[PDB]
Amino acid sequence: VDREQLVQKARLAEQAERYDDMAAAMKNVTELNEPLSNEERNLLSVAYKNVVGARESSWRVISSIEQKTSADGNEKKIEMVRAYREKIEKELEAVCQDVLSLLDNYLIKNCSETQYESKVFYLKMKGDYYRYLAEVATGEKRATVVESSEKAYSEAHEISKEHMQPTHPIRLGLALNYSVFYYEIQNAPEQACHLAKTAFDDAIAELDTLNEDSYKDSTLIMQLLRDNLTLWTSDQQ
């Protein structure tokens, strides 16, 4: 089928909530080796976020079951539960590795110098999916992915501060996800709060930089930021 039909299939899949199809569709689009439009970037992101999310949920439910099943001291049970959690875990990792391959070999790769917004978006995704891997990894595995995630967020932050308005939704999104990385993965609540706080303040200080096309996105992400600053200030107390 044609590119237009693959993107259309991706829209249909989203409606049916068949996110596996949605991701596979946007993967095939990306593999066309052509740049991605804003809509296509969104479809691909939404697609893989829901897939990895679905796995994450299942992974948590089973992992928790693996917790109380081992505490009880069962045997054949831990055998199956562990093997099932590993199956879901393997699936989750494979999904992340799938997007990551797309980002490194197509999206971040084919971007030119002048395309700073795209590079920030894609670098943020890269950080995101390395972050998701960290959530289920430990030891060498975790430290290595926590590292890659860090590297990706940082480089994206460098380009955001240097090329984008503090109110740009992509810059705010990066701040949101990056600050979440600090709090949830780095376990660095101060740094998490600071980044989120700093980001929110910057946008506020330059509230006049908003534009018709994405003012809703900016304000919303700003809300999400303030929400975390409030959700983190109570939990750390």
Partner: peptide, 11 residues
């Protein structure tokens, strides 16, 4: 209590 996050590019 997961914290809030986001990822939707401007379409």
């Amino acid at each position: 209590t997961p914290p809030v996050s986001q990822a939707s590019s401007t379409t």
